[PDB]
Amino acid sequence: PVTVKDLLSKPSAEIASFLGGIYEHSAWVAEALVKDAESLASIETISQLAAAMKAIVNKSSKDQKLELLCAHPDLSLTDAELERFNSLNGAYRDQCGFPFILAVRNATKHTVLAALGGRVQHTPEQEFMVALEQVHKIAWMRLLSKIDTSDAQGFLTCHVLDTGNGCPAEKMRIHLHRLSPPEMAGLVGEFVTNDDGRLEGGPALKGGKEFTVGQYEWTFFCGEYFASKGTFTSGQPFLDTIPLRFGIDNPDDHYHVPLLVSPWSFSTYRGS
Amino acid sequence: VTVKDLLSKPSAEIASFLGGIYEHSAWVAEALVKDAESLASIETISQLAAAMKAIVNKSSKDQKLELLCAHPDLQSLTDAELERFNSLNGAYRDQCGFPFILAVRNATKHTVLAALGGRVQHTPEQEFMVALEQVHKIAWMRLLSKIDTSDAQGFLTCHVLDTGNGCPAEKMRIHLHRLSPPEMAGLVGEFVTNDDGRLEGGPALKGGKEFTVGQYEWTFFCGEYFASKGTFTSGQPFLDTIPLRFGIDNPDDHYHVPLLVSPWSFSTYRGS
Amino acid sequence: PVTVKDLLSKPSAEIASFLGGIYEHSAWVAEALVKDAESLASIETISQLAAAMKAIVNKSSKDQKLELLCAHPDLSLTDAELERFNSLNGAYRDQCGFPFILAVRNATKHTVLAALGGRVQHTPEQEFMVALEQVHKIAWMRLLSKIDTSDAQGFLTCHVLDTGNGCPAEKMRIHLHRLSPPEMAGLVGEFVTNDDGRLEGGPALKGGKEFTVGQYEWTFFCGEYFASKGTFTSGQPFLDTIPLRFGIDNPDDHYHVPLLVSPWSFSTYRGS
Amino acid sequence: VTVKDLLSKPSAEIASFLGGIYEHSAWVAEALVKDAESLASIETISQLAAAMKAIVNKSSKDQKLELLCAHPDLCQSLTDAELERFNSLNGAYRDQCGFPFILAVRNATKHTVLAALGGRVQHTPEQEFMVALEQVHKIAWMRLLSKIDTSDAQGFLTCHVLDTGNGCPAEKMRIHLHRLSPPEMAGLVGEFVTNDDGRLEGGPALKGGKEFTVGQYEWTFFCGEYFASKGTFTSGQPFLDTIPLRFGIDNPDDHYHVPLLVSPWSFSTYRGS
């Protein structure tokens, strides 16, 4: 893997060859990028590099977009699952004019069948938009594999609000595990909230060496918290420990992933 | 001993069987069986618990205080933790006039310390109300352990709503595990949502043989569902597989524990 | 206006004449519809009629769809607003090859300028999907204007859950007003919740004569409810009376518009 | 008189000023002014209220019950039937509790009073003892607010809008804010737009004791325009377009954060900080 800064110090031909496979069988995207020295000089993050290449694709003609879709490679099933795949996969290409495209890196066989089963029912117009979204996702994940992002500045924060009592939840224990990829899976940290309901010690994860792409899981110990306030709960509490499973897709970004909670309800969302 | 079978026994037998539900307080049970026709209309363990609780709650302040003082006082604790515990417990008892009471099943030291550490900060009249709540919770636990509830008729239902698109989420795969108690932990079902976003085949669990007090976990495979719609999600999806951990406290009750979900948010609540 | 049943019993040529203007200058859609006599005999509601015409457009070729879009007419303003409109509107056409189309619910100039300001920045392929969506919305509204839906079977229900205490909210007062269209605007009813947190006496609105398309507003008297339970609230409560403003778009459908509420939070959603 | 002004006065003058905050309970103000350096650290009306509340809370049960009984019995537009039901409930309540029915509500309707009495008469005396004490503290807070000039308070109101359908801040959404009560200060108090962060352009909607004042407010979120700017699918008659958000501000010292979580098909809010 190479850093963004080192990659962009290379000669134009070398950069075009390095990035040539980001959009597979569409090396012309990378060629177009290096042709614009003005924009090449403004790129500093992997997010800006992806956005530049995405912009080239999105501003191209309909024919060139269609050619890009068709250039994309065609995608442990049981005998009947494989037969059904086959039929739907064929029906899709025939009616859309371009292949069924799906970002499968973090998917399973159930994901694929469900995607094909649903999207074969859509108009070619909706699917053209969906297919383009998929190729940009695939390109993003290929870019991440080739670029060293250890220097990224993204970070993960958390907030807990007690919606039963109307206050930040203070002194609540919070654990964080990394679930995937298998290389660095395991405990990331054990934290506690301050009087503002934020993690004591600041962000749970920060920077490209620990705020990395993958799947994570909070454990909020809400049962302990409510007991400390004497809040009424069932003897077998409706909510005790709350797992919150989420993915991080971009090492440049600030993810704020909070919890709103009462003894009888909770909610969370992708914040910033 | 089932509720129907118990309440058919001679009243002195009944008062003896229930005389320890509230510690050293056989007078509650005596008051209960004294009205043979109000007794006759008690049909479920919930109504039995409510009847005894009503006897306690209508008693005098002095009666209630003696009941608290009759309840018995409270492993892995470090020596520092043990000293803090003893210090807090002594402080509690001397400012309140009754012992520290906590209704929890298979508690952790973290729970006890947090509860004690927080509630020793409350006024004696708040703790009076909290202590009584705990004693009723303990009454419920004791009733559940002495009564055969296999004939209970509660049940568990689920609903999934796609808040991104404003429709029920159809054909979503859902698994259910029982986490506790250990003896019957394991996979208890694999489900799929119907056209209305409800479980195909009705309740996930029904009646006292399988809808039993304990801790459970839903697994919602939302990633498959979003992909079926071509809904935009990140390459590493923010949400795809969603765990929902919850407790069941009463085998008589209908528990409705739904999921409200978008690719970027989710919530739940204890419904009925 | 004519009912669906009475429309679809007329000769095929009268039907096509009747529906020739649903899609602007696209009489071929309706004429396509009537060639399917078996398909025609299946349609029972206005929802099913709309879906049938929608399906015909969705199965047509790209150039047909494009010509349908182009057949659509071009779309309070200040000097600066009008010149912004003209510039963006012109730019949009040159970019996409079809005019800017917006399903104006007699909406405001603010909606129009906002839509154009946002959508002029999209790719033509996303905009083609969006334009098609707008055309179908416009068709649906034209269909509602031509069809007598007085015998529609849709209805409105409500449910209130107290997430602060984990129970349905009983005996909460709830008012409902119609805001638009202005001819039928005003109070439609005053209600109270029952034991299950649902409206006493059933649905607030039922059938095509009272459950009609327009804007409505619930008024939930939550302050009164929390006071009745002695639930802690601020002297000036954070939540007292809660307005919930919502639109009904389809007289056939069941709208369930619930409230999840604590003294410190609330949520609602489009249920079915 | 500001808090700064008040607490810089001789202790006898402070005690006289605050002697009626709790009904017939001058002892509260007495205990307050005699800890002269705990007193000295009090900088805001919030802290002043907290200090007096603490004195009450640490008092004996006998002192607390006497404080409750010192409170006036609240026995308008009631019908004859409603008036009889009121007297009946209010009589029952005091009979079973040993102290009068106490309710701290700003401009309470008869519906509020009857609903409160109707519900709380079904509670145990020990639950109601807690509820009553919460009510007297709320009344103390109301009296402090009316006697003290809070124009120098430094609380403020912020807003954030999150698009939960797309997982992004909602940029360029128009947002209006009205004050609904008290009627003397009612009216439009601002028109705003969200920035790229989904927060109000120009910062807090209200700031400081002259505009961030106790009362009832209403946001108006123009979500229909926002969804249209994204090309997000909405119904011809949109389920959600213009969203009112009615809420109360109780403490001019505090930071109130009252955000909107929204999709075309759902929305939620909460009391943030």
Q: Residue D199: helix, strand or coil by DSSP?
A: strand
Report the alpha-carbon distance of residue D209 to residue D207 in Å, rounded: 7
- DSSP element (H, E) containing C266: strand C265-269
Homologous superfamily (CATH) of C1-148 is: Oxo-4-hydroxy-4-carboxy-5-ureidoimidazoline decarboxylase (1.10.3330.10)
Query: Which CATH number fits the domain B149-272, given the four candidates 2.40.10.10, 1.10.290.10, 2.60.40.180, 3.40.50.300?
Result: 2.60.40.180
Q: If contacts are CB pairs under 8 Å, which of residues 93-122 in chain D contact chain C?
A: 103-106, 109, 111-112, 115-116, 118-120
Report the alpha-carbon distance of residue C247 to residue C255 in Å, rounded: 10
Contacts D241 to C, Cβ<8 Å:
247
- Tell me, yes or no, if D210 comes closer than 8 A to chain C by beta carbon: no
Residue C251: phi and psi, rounded to 5, are: -65, -15
Domain boundaries of chain D, sorted by first residue: 1-149, 150-273
From A213's Cα to the closest Cα of chain C, the distance in A is 28
Report the alpha-carbon distance of residue B169 to residue C133 in Å, rounded: 21
From B253's Cα to the closest Cα of chain C, the distance in A is 12
Closest among A105, A110, A98, A109 to A139, alpha carbons compared: A105
**Chains near C (3 or more Cβ pairs under 8 Å):** A, B, D
Closest among C184, C239, C247 to C213, alpha carbons compared: C247
- Tell me, yes or no, if B63 comes closer than 8 A to chain D by beta carbon: no
Are the C-beta atoms of D98 and D71 separated by less than 8 Å?
no
Of the candidates C111, C225, C250, the beta carbon closest to that of D225 is on C111
- Tell me, yes or no, if A179 comes closer than 8 A to chain D by beta carbon: no
C-alpha of C69 from chain center: 22
Q: Residue D235: helix, strand or coil by DSSP?
A: coil
Nearest residue in A to B213, CA atom: A236
- Kindly list the distances between the CA atom of residue C156 and the CA atoms of C67, C218, C253, C258, C271, in Å, as whole numbers in the listed order: 39, 11, 9, 10, 10
Please, what is the angle between helix A124-146 and helix A62-71, to 10°?
60
Contact C271 B167 (CB under 8 A): no
From C270's Cα to the closest Cα of chain B, the distance in A is 6
Contact A166 C263 (CB under 8 A): yes
Q: Resolution of this PDB entry, in A?
A: 1.9
Contact B247 A267 (CB under 8 A): no
Helix H, strand E, coil C: the string for A172-200 is CEEEEEEEECHHHCEEEEEEEECCCCEEC
- Tell me, yes or no, if C268 comes closer than 8 A to chain D by beta carbon: yes
Residues 6+ apart with CB under 8 A from D82: D110, D114
In sequence order, the β-bridge partners of residue A266 are A261, B268
How many contacts does A have with C, using Cβ atoms within 8 A?
Answer: 56
Probe site for chain A from C119, C121, C126 (most A CB atoms < 10 A) = C126
Contact B164 D126 (CB under 8 A): no
- Tell me, yes or no, if C196 comes closer than 8 A to chain B by beta carbon: yes
Report the alpha-carbon distance of residue A249 to residue A71 in Å, rounded: 26
Closest among A232, C212, D248 to B270, alpha carbons compared: A232
Contacts C126 to A, Cβ<8 Å:
129
Residues 6+ apart with CB under 8 A from D184: none
- Tell me, yes or no, if C235 comes closer than 8 A to chain D by beta carbon: yes
What value, to the nearest 5°, has the Cα angle with vertex B91 and ends B88 and B96?
Answer: 120
Contact C269 B163 (CB under 8 A): yes
- Tell me, yes or no, if D124 comes closer than 8 A to chain B by beta carbon: yes
Q: If contacts are CB pairs under 8 Å, which of residues 148-177 in chain B contact chain A?
A: 171, 173
Nearest residue in D to A270, CA atom: D167
DSSP state of C73: P
Contact C165 A264 (CB under 8 A): yes
Are B1-148 and B149-272 the same fold in CATH? no
From C56's Cα to the closest Cα of chain D, the distance in A is 20
Q: How many CA atoms lie within 13 A of C108 on its CB side?
A: 10
Q: Residue A100: helix, strand or coil by DSSP?
A: coil
From C55's Cα to the closest Cα of chain B, the distance in A is 18
C-alpha torsion sign, points D130, D131, D132, D136: positive
Residues 6+ apart with CB under 8 A from C272: B167, B168, B196, B197, C253, C254, C255, C256
What value, to the nearest 5°, has the Cα angle with vertex A113 and ends A109 and A114?
Answer: 110
Helix H, strand E, coil C: the string for chain B is CCHHHHCCCCHHHHHHHCCCCCCCCHHHHHHHHHCHHHHHCCCCHHHHHHHHHHHHHCCCHHHHHHHHHHCCCCCCCCHHHHHHHHHHHHHHHHHHCCCCCCCCCCCCHHHHHHHHHHHCCCCHHHHHHHHHHHHHHHHHHHHHHHCCCCCCCCEEECEEEECCCCEECCCCEEEEEEEECHHHCEEEEEEEECCCCEECCCCCEECCCCCCCEEEEEEEEHHHHHHHHCCCCCCCCCCCEEEEEEEECCCCCEEECCEEEECCEEEEECEC
Contacts 24+ apart (CB under 8 A), D40-48: D40/D7, D42/D3, D42/D7, D43/D3, D43/D4, D44/D3, D44/D153, D44/D253, D45/D3, D45/D144, D45/D145, D45/D148, D45/D150, D45/D153, D45/D252, D45/D253, D46/D251, D46/D253, D46/D254, D48/D3, D48/D7, D48/D144, D48/D148
Closest among B128, B94, B88 to B109, alpha carbons compared: B88
Of the candidates D228, D235, D242, the beta carbon closest to that of C114 is on D228
Of the candidates A114, A237, A270, the beta carbon closest to that of B247 is on A237
From D22's Cα to the closest Cα of chain B, the distance in A is 18
Probe site for chain C from A129, A229, A236 (most C CB atoms < 10 A) = A129
Contact B128 D125 (CB under 8 A): no
C-alpha torsion sign, points D197, D199, D200, D206: negative
Contacts A115 to B, Cβ<8 Å:
227-228, 230
Are the C-beta atoms of A174 and A200 separated by less than 8 Å?
no
Of the candidates C161, C196, C269, the beta carbon closest to that of B260 is on C269
- Kindly list the distances between the CA atom of residue C187 and the CA atoms of B53, C155, C177, C240, in Å, as whole numbers in the listed order: 44, 17, 4, 20
Report the alpha-carbon distance of residue B98 to residue B69 in Å, rounded: 5
Are the C-beta atoms of B27 and B52 separated by less than 8 Å?
no
Q: Is A32 left (phi over 0), alpha (psi -120 to 50) or beta?
A: alpha
Contacts A262 to C, Cβ<8 Å:
163-164, 166, 262, 265
How many residues are given for chain D?
Answer: 273
Pairing status of strand C173-180 against strand C214-221: antiparallel
Report the alpha-carbon distance of residue A107 to residue A115 in Å, rounded: 10
| Experimental approach | X-ray
Are the C-beta atoms of A204 and A244 separated by less than 8 Å?
no
Q: Is the peptide bond before C181 cis (omega within 30 degrees of 0)?
A: yes
From D225's Cα to the closest Cα of chain C, the distance in A is 4
- Kindly list the distances between the CA atom of residue A177 and the CA atoms of A92, A219, C32, C199, D131, in Å, as whole numbers in the listed order: 40, 8, 58, 45, 42
- Tell me, yes or no, if A25 comes closer than 8 A to chain D by beta carbon: no
Nearest residue in A to B115, CA atom: A228
Query: Which CATH number fits the domain D1-149, given the four candidates 1.10.10.10, 1.10.3330.10, 3.40.630.30, 3.20.20.70?
Result: 1.10.3330.10
Contacts D165 to B, Cβ<8 Å:
163-164, 262, 264
Report the alpha-carbon distance of residue C243 to residue C228 in Å, rounded: 20
- Tell me, yes or no, if A75 comes closer than 8 A to chain D by beta carbon: no
- Kindly list the distances between the CA atom of residue D79 and the CA atoms of A39, B99, C171, D76, D110, in Å, as whole numbers in the listed order: 77, 49, 20, 9, 10
Of the candidates D214, D231, D236, the beta carbon closest to that of C236 is on D214
The yes/no answer on whether domain D150-273 falls in CATH 2.60.40.180 is yes
